[PDB]
Amino acid sequence: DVEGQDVLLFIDNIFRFTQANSEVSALLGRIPAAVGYQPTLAEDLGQLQERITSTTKGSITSVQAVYVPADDITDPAPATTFSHLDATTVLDRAVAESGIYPAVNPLECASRIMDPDVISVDHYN
Amino acid sequence: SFFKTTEMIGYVHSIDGTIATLIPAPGNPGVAYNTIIQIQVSPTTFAAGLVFNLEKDGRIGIILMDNITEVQSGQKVMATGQLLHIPVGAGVLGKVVNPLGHEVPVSTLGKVDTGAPNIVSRSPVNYNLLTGFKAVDTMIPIGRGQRELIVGDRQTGKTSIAVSTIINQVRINQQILSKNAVISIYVSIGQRCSNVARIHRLLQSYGALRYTTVMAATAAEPAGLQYLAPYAGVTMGEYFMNRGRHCLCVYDDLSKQAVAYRQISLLLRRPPGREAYPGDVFYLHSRLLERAAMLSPGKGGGSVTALPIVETLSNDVTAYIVTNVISITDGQIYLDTKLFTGGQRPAVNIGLSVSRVGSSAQNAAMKGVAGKLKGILAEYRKLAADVQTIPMIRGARFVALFNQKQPSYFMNAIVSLYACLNGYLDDVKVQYVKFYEYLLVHRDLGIMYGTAKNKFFYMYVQELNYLIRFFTLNSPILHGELEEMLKQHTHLFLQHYQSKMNAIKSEKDVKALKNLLYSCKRAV
Amino acid sequence: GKLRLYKEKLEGYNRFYSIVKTIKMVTLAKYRAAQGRIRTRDFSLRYTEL
Amino acid sequence: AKKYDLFGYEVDTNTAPWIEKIKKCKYYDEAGEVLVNMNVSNCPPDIATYNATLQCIYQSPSKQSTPVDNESKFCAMMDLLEEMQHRNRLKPNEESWTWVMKECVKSGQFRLGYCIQQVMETECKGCPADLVKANEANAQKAKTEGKEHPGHLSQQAGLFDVKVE
Numbered sequence A: 001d002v003e004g005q006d007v008l009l010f011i012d013n014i015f016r017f018t019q020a021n022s023e024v025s026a027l028l029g030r031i032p033a034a035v036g037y038q039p040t041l042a043e044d045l046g047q048l049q050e051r052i053t054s055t056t057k058g059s060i061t062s063v064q065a066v067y068v069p070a071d072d073i074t075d076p077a078p079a080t081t082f083s084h085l086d087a088t089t090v091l092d093r094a095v096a097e098s099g100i101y102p103a104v105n106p107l108e109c110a111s112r113i114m115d116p117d118v119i120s121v122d123h124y125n
Numbered sequence B: 001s002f003f004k005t006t007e008m009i010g011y012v013h014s015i016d017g018t019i020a021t022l023i024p025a026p027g028n029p030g031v032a033y034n035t036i037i038q039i040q041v042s043p044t045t046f047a048a049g050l051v052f053n054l055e056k057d058g059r060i061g062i063i064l065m066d067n068i069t070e071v072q073s074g075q076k077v078m079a080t081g082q083l084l085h086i087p088v089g090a091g092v093l094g095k096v097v098n099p100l101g102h103e104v105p106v107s108t109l110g111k112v113d114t115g116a117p118n119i120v121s122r123s124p125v126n127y128n129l130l131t132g133f134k135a136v137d138t139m140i141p142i143g144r145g146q147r148e149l150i151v152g153d154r155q156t157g158k159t160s161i162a163v164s165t166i167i168n169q170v171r172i173n174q175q176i177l178s179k180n181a182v183i184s185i186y187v188s189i190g191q192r193c194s195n196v197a198r199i200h201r202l203l204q205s206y207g208a209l210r211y212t213t214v215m216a217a218t219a220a221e222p223a224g225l226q227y228l229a230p231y232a233g234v235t236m237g238e239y240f241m242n243r244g245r246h247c248l249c250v251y252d253d254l255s256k257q258a259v260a261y262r263q264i265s266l267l268l269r270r271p272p273g274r275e276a277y278p279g280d281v282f283y284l285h286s287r288l289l290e291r292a293a294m295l296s297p298g299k300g301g302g303s304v305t306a307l308p309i310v311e312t313l314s315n316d317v318t319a320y321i322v323t324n325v326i327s328i329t330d331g332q333i334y335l336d337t338k339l340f341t342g343g344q345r346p347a348v349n350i351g352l353s354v355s356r357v358g359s360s361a362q363n364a365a366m367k368g369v370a371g372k373l374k375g376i377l378a379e380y381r382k383l384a385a386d387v388q389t390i391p392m393i394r395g396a397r398f399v400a401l402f403n404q405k406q407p408s409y410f411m412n413a414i415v416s417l418y419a420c421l422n423g424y425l426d427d428v429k430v431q432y433v434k435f436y437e438y439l440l441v442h443r444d445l446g447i448m449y450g451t452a453k454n455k456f457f458y459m460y461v462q463e464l465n466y467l468i469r470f471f472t473l474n475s476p477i478l479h480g481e482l483e484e485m486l487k488q489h490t491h492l493f494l495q496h497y498q499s500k501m502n503a504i505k506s507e508k509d510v511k512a513l514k515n516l517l518y519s520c521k522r523a524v
Numbered sequence C: 001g002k003l004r005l006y007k008e009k010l011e012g013y014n015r016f017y018s019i020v021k022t023i024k025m026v027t028l029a030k031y032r033a034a035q036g037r038i039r040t041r042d043f044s045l046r047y048t049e050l
Numbered sequence D: 001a002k003k004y005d006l007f008g009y010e011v012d013t014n015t016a017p018w019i020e021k022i023k024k025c026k027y028y029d030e031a032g033e034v035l036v037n038m039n040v041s042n043c044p045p046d047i048a049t050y051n052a053t054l055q056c057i058y059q060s061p062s063k064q065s066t067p068v069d070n071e072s073k074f075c076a077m078m079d080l081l082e083e084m085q086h087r088n089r090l091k092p093n094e095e096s097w098t099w100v101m102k103e104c105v106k107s108g109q110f111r112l113g114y115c116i117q118q119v120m121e122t123e124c125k126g127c128p129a130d131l132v133k134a135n136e137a138n139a140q141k142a143k144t145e146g147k148e149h150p151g152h153l154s155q156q157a158g159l160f161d162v163k164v165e
């Protein structure tokens, strides 16, 4: 905002934010939602992740790590995060153990800029 | 808007993020249920809130909406004594708006809390609503006033198919009488902020903002707004419905609304049940979707069509929020993840998808071709599991035709499907169907100096669209003239254009063939 | 977790049945072609026995 | 004389008051707003009402003060026919399709005119002549002046080279 600049942000790990809030939320006396997380799980990520964005003044370009607990991608902590992201990188354990590193399962992955308008036609095809 | 204060009902006692409870002021006035209340954050500014609990003590449970950081304990609370009304009309179109009604910078009011039309108020759905997709408009046809669910995983094309349905209306709406124009209302519940901006620009570039208004409650904004966002969306549509006009309502998505309502319910100590949701989470979506309807001739004959989106986690329909919305809506449009990555886009799983009022909803012309397609694809799917028959050839071409990025015009869709039905793409190979379809719509081979001689029927004349809708293709007026156009197009395409494929077996020509064919998938 | 994996185990057997049913049905066609024989047979090797 | 709706309640057949509202038209989008107001007051459009609307589509300019993008009196006109035939269940009489033929020759869209005289001749067994020669005049007008089709699209020999845009 102030200096007006392109900046990188590196959050390792964004699950630990949600998990940290899950500890206090129990002791604060809130009733837990699905899978024992705080009821404000979507709202906690909302106010944090919305601040991470490219404004007119400058530009944040945030890489984040997301822990998938028990390799369960349907869990609220990653599932809620997926909606916020521009390029979702999904790492699979079976791909890692087979020998392929990095362990990126390309079918579950996605990117917004995977589009003939942004990247070249030869890239997309 | 700036709401109307009346009486100072109490003081703020506790806050818990976006929820609060009040203590009543001396006298114990008692605010009415489900009404707006203004909390004085400063002498000049207020902060809105909705009443959700009226306890025996005199205490009043509040759902915070505006200026949540500025709310504090001990602040004064003024009451409206009224249900939430918002700005509604034609003047609100082409703008982004909150559930409370404030415009986002980038008209008589109407109640958000309203009962749905009763038994004698409604009528059977007859008017069609074109999504602009050959897969949908044939097999899973949506009628005006119908509630058609969109389900599937993340990045399966749930938003795109809903947004392109709004964009498909502009070509019709521009040409038709404004009485029958489909005014759209895209509700964005719990989404990322930049996603709303990209949809705004995408709607603006296709001229959709003229016939569209964008309800918006982003992820930054609180649960109170997200909870109320689909209700504010329908209110804006009901104006057009009750005043004899047809409307469309997209909720993107009801999954994030439920999570926002669960937050509100849990924070106010409402007893939770299945997957920690309250008892009335079914009632939440039910009273929303039932307000979408097709009214009778006695009350204008207007409509609000609903396209609720509901995200599933790894193709799991057994989840509580997903199973609830399926039981309310009139069937669904299931988007499979394997079909998306496989190639088929939109990735519409026809076996899983269904429209409960399909036949009556379709156009007379579209009903003619589509009735046969159900018989062909049924036999093709069975024979594919278990030597090429006529159904096997023609069935495979339909699958190639269903792939499309942007929505097709009704004339350009139905003719390319009619060609495949009567078997004009049998000699044409499966990979060259999109090149065949492109040369049918934009270009024309008969007129391309030679064997033309048609008196009226051509594809460049887009105005024939509405004559086809009246008379159908299978009719003495257009049947003979249409079958000329297709006979000229096939014979010339097979002779002059498809002859290249036996030829082209070299570097820089095979690649040129690919780049040509890949671009043909996008433009229908 | 368990809800997804037991479904994917069940989806595994569904693909198993469909592929094995393809072998079943294909070998019926061969069995129909092959049984065009039982009506004939045997009389061709009369003097082969001697 | 008497009529009933789908439930069986009484319906207002008094059409004549709503007809004179459509005559004071000015711009043809206002005719639709009247057609809404009849249905709202349990008074379904009569066969004469649709023809009175069809008249206003022909006579006036387009929607209202400002012009809309890609105006089409024919498309607005043919939508109204689809409403009366399929949904409301009313066969358009000889007057209905004569208003359609007038708009083809007036705007100059002769290619539509060829299709709709075929329609008007068949089924409803009537050839109005007056407009047939006026339509055929516009057909010859396109041929002798320059060319009848788009022109730039037709002549350009594609074959492998076709622009995708």
Ligand SMILES: Nc1ncnc2c1ncn2[C@@H]1O[C@H](COP(=O)(O)OP(=O)(O)O)[C@@H](O)[C@H]1O
Binding pocket: A111, A112, A114, A115, B153, B154, B155, B156, B157, B158, B159, B160, B161, B345, B346, B347, B404, B405, B406
């Ligand atoms: N019919 C289609 N053809 C090609 N690409 C599509 C189609 N529909 C969606 N997409 C692509 O898929 C991606 C995700 O689409 P989106 O509508 O955001 O899905 P979801 O709402 O399920 O996340 C986008 O980048 C979009 O370009």
Ligand SMILES: [Mg+2]
Binding pocket: B158, B159, B160, B252
């Ligand atoms: Mg989406």
